[PDB]
Design a protein around this ligand. Structure first.
Ligand SMILES: [Mg+2]
Ligand SMILES: [Mg+2]
Ligand SMILES: [Mg+2]
Ligand SMILES: [Mg+2]
Ligand SMILES: [Mg+2]
Ligand SMILES: [Zn+2]
Lengths: 68, 100, 84, 114, 177
RNA sequence: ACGACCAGGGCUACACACGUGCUACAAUGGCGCAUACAAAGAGAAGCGACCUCGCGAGAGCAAGCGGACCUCAUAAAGUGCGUCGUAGUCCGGAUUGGAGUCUGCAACUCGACUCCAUGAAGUCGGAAUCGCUAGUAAUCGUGGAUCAGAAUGCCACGGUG
């Protein structure tokens, strides 16, 4: 690769709400946080995870403590 | 107005008479209570599906002689034209023209 | 805005048919007339056809749509501008 | 004089100078500088470094910089893609709080073109 | 990268016991990943081109090549030699890093994602799909974005037919609808 | 069926033009502190005190009052002190985003009000045109009808003048 003409490309940390963490090379320049990742998706897993601990549906649940 | 609107308003009055009692005691008090049984007050909010007309908020004050939905006066129960022509004949006690 | 203490307002008829749907999955886009109700997280799954005055616009509910009412996602006034 | 917020505070007074930072108004400025324990009528002049460093500790507790502009842009974008009523009003530059559009909608429509 | 290691242990053995290959050089492998952004509206404003190419430099760590029109077309008022598109070719390590980055972080970002098609196989074994917005990638922060744009992603494989390509991709956890 | 019932929508739209008002463009003012003087009216499926809670809108508890008694209900301009010192401003509040409260079966279209945050146009307005001869004009608050809720409108009241 040419030396200077390319953007910076560093190894950084990616953190998901399900807790799976990845060491990914990219141009973001710093660690970043994913609300949804590949494990965190209903389509791939077929399980429809409900861990919205840091989420909006959860705000709706603590806000109105409705029963089933 | 038409006979349908006077028939429509009588119905609302009539229904409200029946459920006026039913509602406030069970539903409103439970919905406002501080004890607030989360399960039971939630149940009665679903249960607030009685006939809509039985709400007192659906009543429109119409003239008792014509049925005018506008120009009502709660002192007489009539519209503006009806209270003027009834007051002009002296058919309303103590109602004379005002001047100050 | 609902007073919070009273809690979210839902239509009993809409809640009953959406739980029948949420158990047996998607069979058809179930239609309804209650645009005044909020959408629950349990109903976040099916496709809901909200009545807009003449038709029933089908709107699949997403996670961000939760809390919002149904009638926000159903336009009633057709406006495509003034000079066309 | 210079605060962690990119916005640089003006010399005259303190509560008004704090308001210059986007995202903090009068009451938050009233709460922040009263938590600082300083008189409110002092300027950034006739003031040492030992107060504005304490101000940097207190302002950072509130989420107030151009990062707040990211929140409002993302909140606006939430209403756009949601297909809600507010997003179509945000799409066409129309008022979204239910104000009348027949007349007196200039602040949203903008000056009329012919 | 991670999937290059993952390819060399698992994927090669999972495929030759399935297609009954006699050589390990017979298994499908990926040549290159081409990201193509055709801006088109650059003729009206070429600074828009300077933005869109920069987004590819944000997506992959490679300066993109500004493609030209290659001919004069009257249906679009472009002439031969006008810079209209941006293209990045990813091979090697950068390809694998970008591929894990797309599968792990980017592809679980499309709203109402319900599986990409297996019908788009080029008819010889190369995969192609088209993203509509660039903010699915984590490097693209939206407040500095001028316009949301689409992106072509072309997966070039050594497969001779389409079923080897779908079996190569499906071993890498591809979400085929 | 041009009759009757119901659910939802619309009467609230919006490239535009006009009428009538509210708010301003500020220093005879804005803001903070302390403090003074009304009139008139309403009230029982109503007015709702005191106390407590919540920054607040409000909530809880709960008297009194069918009323020259209780409640709504603290009038504001004004007065004294301090600051801002001519800036699109400590002017102006539009708009917008988040968080709320009340009423109502139900506040998305399409309610009112509160809190935080942003702080638009506007720096006195062309031809033209309106009201007013004294407690009047101008200004500042107050109440009522309609009304579950929804006044910058309307109908009344007083203060300065
Ligand atoms: Mg008749
Ligand atoms: Mg009514
Ligand atoms: Mg009208
Ligand atoms: Mg000036
Ligand atoms: Mg007067
Ligand atoms: Zn995850």
């Amino acid at each position: 690769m040419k030396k200077d003409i390319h953007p910076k490309y560093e190894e950084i940390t990616a953190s998901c709400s399900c807790g799976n963490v990845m060491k990914i090379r990219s141009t973001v320049g710093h660690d970043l946080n994913l609300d949804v990742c590949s494990k965190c998706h209903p389509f791939f897993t077929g399980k429809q995870r409900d861990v919205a601990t840091g989420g909006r549906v959860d705000r709706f649940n603590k806000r109105f403590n409705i029963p089933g | 107005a038409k006979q349908s609107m006077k028939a429509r308003e009588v119905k609302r009055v009539a229904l409200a008479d029946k459920y006026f009692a039913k509602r406030a005691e069970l539903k409103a008090i439970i919905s406002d209570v501080n004890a607030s049984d989360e399960d039971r007050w939630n149940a009665v909010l679903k249960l607030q599906t009685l006939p809509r007309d039985s709400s007192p908020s659906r009543q429109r004050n119409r003239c008792r002689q014509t049925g005018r939905p506008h120009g009502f006066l709660r002192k007489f129960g009539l519209s503006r034209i009806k209270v003027r022509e009834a007051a002009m004949r002296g058919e309303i006690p103590g109602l004379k023209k005002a001047s100050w | 805005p609902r007073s919070l203490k009273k809690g979210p307002f839902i239509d009993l008829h809409l809640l009953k048919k959406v739980e029948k749907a949420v158990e047996s999955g998607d069979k058809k886009p179930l239609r309804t007339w209650s645009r005044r109700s909020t959408i629950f997280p349990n109903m976040i799954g099916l496709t809901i056809a909200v009545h807009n005055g003449r038709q029933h616009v089908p709107v699949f509910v997403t996670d961000e749509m939760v809390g919002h009412k149904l009638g926000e996602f159903a336009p009633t006034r057709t406006y495509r501008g003034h000079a066309a | 004089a210079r605060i962690a917020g990119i916005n640089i505070p003006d010399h005259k007074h303190a509560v008004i100078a704090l308001t210059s930072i986007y995202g903090v108004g009068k009451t938050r400025s009233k709460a922040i500088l009263a938590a600082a324990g300083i008189a409110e009528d002092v300027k950034i002049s006739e003031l040492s470094e030992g107060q504005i460093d304490t101000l940097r500790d207190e302002v950072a507790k509130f989420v107030v910089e151009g990062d707040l502009r990211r929140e409002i842009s993302m909140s606006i974008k939430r209403l756009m893609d949601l297909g809600c009523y507010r997003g179509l009003r945000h799409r066409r530059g129309l008022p979204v709080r239910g104000q009348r559009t027949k007349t007196n909608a200039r602040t949203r429509k903008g000056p009329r073109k012919p | 990268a991670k999937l290059h290691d993952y390819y060399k242990d698992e994927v090669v053995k999972k495929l030759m016991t399935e297609f009954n290959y006699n050589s390990v050089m017979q298994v499908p492998r990926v040549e290159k990943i081409t990201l193509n952004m055709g801006v088109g509206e650059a003729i009206a404003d070429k600074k828009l081109l300077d933005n869109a190419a920069a987004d590819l430099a944000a997506i992959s760590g490679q300066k993109p090549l500004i493609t030209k029109a290659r001919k004069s077309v009257a249906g679009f008022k472009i002439r031969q030699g006008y810079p209209i598109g941006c293209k990045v070719t990813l091979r090697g390590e950068r390809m694998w890093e970008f591929f894990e980055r797309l599968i792990t972080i980017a592809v679980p970002r499309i709203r109402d994602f319900r599986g990409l098609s297996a019908k788009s196989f080029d008819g010889r074994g190369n995969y192609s799909m088209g993203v509509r917005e660039q903010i699915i990638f984590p490097e693209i922060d939206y407040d500095k974005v001028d316009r949301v744009r689409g992106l072509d992603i072309t997966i070039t494989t050594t497969a001779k037919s389409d079923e080897e390509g779908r079996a190569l991709l499906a071993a890498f956890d591809f979400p085929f609808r």
